[PDB]
Amino acid sequence: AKLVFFAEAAIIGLMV
Amino acid sequence: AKLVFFAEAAIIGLMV
Amino acid sequence: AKLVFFAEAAIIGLMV
Amino acid sequence: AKLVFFAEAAIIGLMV
Amino acid sequence: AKLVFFAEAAIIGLMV
Amino acid sequence: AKLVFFAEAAIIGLMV
Amino acid sequence: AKLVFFAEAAIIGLMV
Amino acid sequence: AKLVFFAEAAIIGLMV
Amino acid sequence: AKLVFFAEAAIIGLMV
Amino acid sequence: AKLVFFAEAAIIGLMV
Amino acid sequence: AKLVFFAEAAIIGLMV
Amino acid sequence: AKLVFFAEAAIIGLMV
Amino acid sequence: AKLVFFAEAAIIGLMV
Amino acid sequence: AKLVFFAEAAIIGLMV
Amino acid sequence: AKLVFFAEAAIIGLMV
Amino acid sequence: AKLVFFAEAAIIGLMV
Amino acid sequence: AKLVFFAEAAIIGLMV
Amino acid sequence: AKLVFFAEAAIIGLMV
Amino acid sequence: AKLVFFAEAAIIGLMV
Amino acid sequence: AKLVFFAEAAIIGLMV
Amino acid sequence: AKLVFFAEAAIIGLMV
Amino acid sequence: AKLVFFAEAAIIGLMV
Amino acid sequence: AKLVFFAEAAIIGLMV
Amino acid sequence: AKLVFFAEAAIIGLMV
Ligand SMILES: [Cl-]
Ligand SMILES: [Cl-]
Ligand SMILES: [Cl-]
Ligand SMILES: [Cl-]
Ligand SMILES: [Cl-]
Ligand SMILES: [Cl-]
Ligand SMILES: [Cl-]
Ligand SMILES: [Cl-]
Ligand SMILES: [Cl-]
Ligand SMILES: [Cl-]
Ligand SMILES: [Cl-]
Ligand SMILES: [Cl-]
Ligand SMILES: [Cl-]
Ligand SMILES: [Cl-]
Ligand SMILES: [Cl-]
Ligand SMILES: [Cl-]
Ligand SMILES: [Cl-]
Ligand SMILES: [Cl-]
Ligand SMILES: [Cl-]
Ligand SMILES: [Cl-]
Ligand SMILES: [Cl-]
Ligand SMILES: [Cl-]
Ligand SMILES: [Cl-]
Ligand SMILES: [Cl-]
């Protein structure tokens, strides 16, 4: 799956 | 180059 | 914000 | 998984 | 139609 | 900002 | 409109 | 050839 | 999953 | 809507 | 910021 | 629908 | 110049 | 095949 | 030419 | 023609 | 933010 | 699943 | 780099 | 047919 | 302007 | 390679 | 006109 | 790399 990253702090990566 | 991330485990970052 | 990645080496993650 | 949205009314969110 | 979401508050879903 | 949704369960929406 | 096909079962064709 | 779909109703699948 | 069609005759649809 | 032209004969213009 | 336009009538211009 | 602007004079906004 | 087509009916071909 | 138009006058359409 | 809008306040549109 | 690959096992490539 | 440049002379860059 | 290809040498085909 | 496949015979893989 | 160009040196123009 | 090539033989390039 | 500009300050131009 | 940038070194900005 | 052509004169081919 592709991996998408967000900066919220904390960085979280979500799978696609 | 653009960096594209995948998750398979292990992360793989591939480039453009 | 979403993190967009480039590689030039240095990896750069910029926030959208 | 990422949720992709369409509208046809019914709203449909499909998972990638 | 494709449904595109925005956040301004309030959520706004606009279509294609 | 644009809104991106993921199904993880729980649905979470992240801003861009 | 463009027609986009998905498989979930059942086929779902959504439009643009 | 790949089949590309439109809807106008009539459904049209054209070959690429 | 997304559905992709090909004309080979016989029409075959492959999942993504 | 965007208009997309094809040639098969006859011309077919399909829309988005 | 860039202005992105939709029409749903109301015209909506959202800022990026 | 997405709204696309052109300048020719006069402005013309066309949609998707 | 390239001709880009929309339909709104009136067909509009704009030059790029 | 897809049809691409150009304004050169005279309008000419080329197949893809 | 295409028209691109920015919010700077004042809204300014630039031609492409 | 472009070549598209699928993993079904067996890998099959379809022409476009 | 992304940076977009225009030639108007004077070159001006607008943020996105 | 569809196979997406990169080259970094090693050729990598990842499944969608 | 992204790898793009074509079929002409012989296969040709070209890169981005 | 449209000619698509790559460079790998050799320049390659492939027909669509 | 961008340059687009077609194979018709004779190769012809059209400006955009 | 394509050059993409960002503003953070300082300008950063990253490539494809 | 919009300025599109490449790098080949020389930086080239072309006008659209 | 993809090769992109422009016309200014002189032809300039730039790459991705
Ligand atoms: Cl945000
Ligand atoms: Cl280095
Ligand atoms: Cl993005
Ligand atoms: Cl997942
Ligand atoms: Cl209804
Ligand atoms: Cl997606
Ligand atoms: Cl074929
Ligand atoms: Cl009908
Ligand atoms: Cl296609
Ligand atoms: Cl801004
Ligand atoms: Cl109304
Ligand atoms: Cl944008
Ligand atoms: Cl021209
Ligand atoms: Cl009407
Ligand atoms: Cl165009
Ligand atoms: Cl699958
Ligand atoms: Cl190596
Ligand atoms: Cl894909
Ligand atoms: Cl042809
Ligand atoms: Cl060489
Ligand atoms: Cl093409
Ligand atoms: Cl202009
Ligand atoms: Cl050099
Ligand atoms: Cl552009």
Please write down the HEC assignment for all residues of I1-16: CEEEEEECCCEEEEEC
N12 near N4, Cβ under 8 Å? no
The Cα angle at residue N5 between residues N4 and N11, in degrees rounded to 5: 155
Q: Tell me which chain R residues have a C-beta less than 8 angstroms from the C-beta of S4.
A: 5
In this structure, what are the phi and psi dihedrals at residue W10, rounded to the nearest 5 degrees?
-100, 135
Q: How far is CA N7 from the centre of its chain?
A: 8
Inspect the structure and tell me whether chains C and A have 3 or more CB pairs less than 8 Å apart. yes
The count of residues in chain M is 16
Distance CA R4, CA H4 (A): 20
Q: In the numeric block, which tokens belong to residue I8? A: 């080979």
**Distance (Å) from the C-alpha of residue B9 to the closest C-alpha of chain A?**
11
- Quote the strand ranges of F1-16, DSSP E: 3-7, 11-15
Q: Tell me which chain B residues have a C-beta less than 8 angstroms from the C-beta of R12.
A: 12, 14
DSSP assigned state of E2:
B
Whether the CB of S11 is below 8 Å from some CB of chain X: the reply is no
D3 near D11, Cβ under 8 Å? no
Nearest to R8 among B6, B8, B14 (CB): B14
DSSP P1-16: -BEEEEE---EEEEE-
Q: How far is CA U13 from the centre of its chain?
A: 2
Three-class secondary structure assignment of chain C: CEEEEEECCCEEEEEC
Q: Tell me which chain I residues have a C-beta less than 8 angstroms from the C-beta of R2.
A: 4, 14, 16
3-state secondary structure of E7: strand
Residue with tokens 């485990």: B9
With CA atoms as reference, report the closest residue to V6 among C2, C1, F3, C16: C16
L15 near L3, Cβ under 8 Å? yes
Distance CA J12, CA J3 (A): 10
Whether the CB of Q8 is below 8 Å from some CB of chain O: the reply is yes
Q: In the numeric block, which tokens belong to residue V1? A: 């390679």
Q: Using what technique was this structure determined?
A: X-ray
Ligand number with the minimum distance to the CA of K10: 11
Distance K13 CA to ligand 11 centre (A): 17
Distance CA O13, CA J13 (A): 31
With CA atoms as reference, report the closest residue to X16 among X7, X3, X5, X6: X3
- Burial class of residue F8 (count of CB atoms within 10 Å of its CB; 0-12, 13-18, 19+): exposed
Distance CA T5, CA X5 (A): 9
Q: What sign for the dihedral angle of Cα U16, V6, V12, V14?
A: negative
Distance Q16 CA to ligand 12 centre (A): 7
Residue with tokens 């943020």: Q15
Interface test with H, best of J3, J4, J11, J14 (most H CBs within 10 A): J14
Name the residue type at position D4.
V
3-state secondary structure of K16: coil
Strands S3-7 and R11-15: unpaired
Q: How many CB atoms lie within 10 A of CB W8?
A: 12
V12 near V6, Cβ under 8 Å? yes
CA atoms within 13 A on the CB side of I1: 12
DSSP assigned state of L2:
B
Distance CA U5, CA D8 (A): 39
Residues with Cβ < 8 Å from K6, sequence gap 6 or more? Answer: E4, E14, E15, K12, K14, L1, L2, L3
Q: In the numeric block, which tokens belong to residue H8? A: 């106008």
Q: How many CB atoms lie within 10 A of CB Q11?
A: 11
Dmax over CA atoms of chain T, in Å, equals 25
With CA atoms as reference, report the closest residue to G12 among X1, S4, J12, D15: D15
**N6, T6, X1, X2 from X13: Cα distances, Å:** 21, 10, 11, 10
Whether the CB of B15 is below 8 Å from some CB of chain V: the reply is no
Q: In the numeric block, which tokens belong to residue E1? A: 């139609």
Q: What sign for the dihedral angle of Cα B5, B6, B12, B16?
A: negative
X11 near T13, Cβ under 8 Å? no
Task: Write out the residues surrounding ion ligand 10, Cβ under 5 A.
Answer: K 1; Q 1, 15
Distance CA X16, CA X5 (A): 11
